[PDB]
Amino acid sequence: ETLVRPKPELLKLLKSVGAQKDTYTMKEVLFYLGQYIMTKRLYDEKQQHIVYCSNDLLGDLFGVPSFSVKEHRKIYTMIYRNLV
Numbered sequence: 001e002t003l004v005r006p007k008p009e010l011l012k013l014l015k016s017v018g019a020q021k022d023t024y025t026m027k028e029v030l031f032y033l034g035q036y037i038m039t040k041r042l043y044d045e046k047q048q049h050i051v052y053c054s055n056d057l058l059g060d061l062f063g064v065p066s067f068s069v070k071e072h073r074k075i076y077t078m079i080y081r082n083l084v
């Protein structure tokens with residue numbers, strides 16, 4: 001139920017995929033990031049689970065060049081780095 005306030009860069013990213021809010025549940029953040037990954041085609045066509053964000057704003061925000069979507073605890077850390 002927790003509402004979080006994204007830092008400026010993550011907030012702009014969320015707004016790029018149609019987010020209209022100031023604060024978000026972690027669920028909404030994950031949905032919007034998933035939409036971002038889909039729209040920017042940061043997932044690989046052939047390779048399961050891996051998101052390639054090295055060329056992308058997302059990579060700048062997360063501080064990694066790639067990650068697996070299976071690693072939920074790591075994903076939470078990467079997002080929380082970008083929350084107030």
Ligand SMILES: CCOc1cc2c(cc1OCC)[C@H](c1ccc(Cl)cc1)N(c1ccc(C)cc1OCc1nnn[nH]1)C(=O)C2
Nearest residue numbers: 027028030031033034035037043049050051069070072075
């Ligand atoms: C209540 C809503 O919850 C979630 C929604 C979404 C995800 C995880 C969630 O919750 C778990 C933390 C993840 C995802 C992973 C990491 C981030 Cl940086 C962003 C989004 N995703 C997603 C993105 C890419 C790929 C290849 C599979 C995905 O998703 C199936 C998948 N996820 N894990 N295995 N398969 C979404 O499109 C939305």
Ligand SMILES: CCOc1cc2c(cc1OCC)[C@H](c1ccc(Cl)cc1)N(c1ccc(C)cc1OCc1nnn[nH]1)C(=O)C2
Nearest residue numbers: 064066067068069070071072073074075076077078079080
């Ligand atoms: C109550 C919160 O729980 C946890 C949170 C986190 C982790 C483990 C947890 O609990 C298990 C010990 C682990 C991690 C591993 C060891 C330590 Cl020395 C520090 C952090 N991690 C994490 C860090 C780096 C990498 C490359 C992957 C990670 O994570 C994979 C991963 N594991 N599960 N999903 N993704 C986190 O970013 C947060």
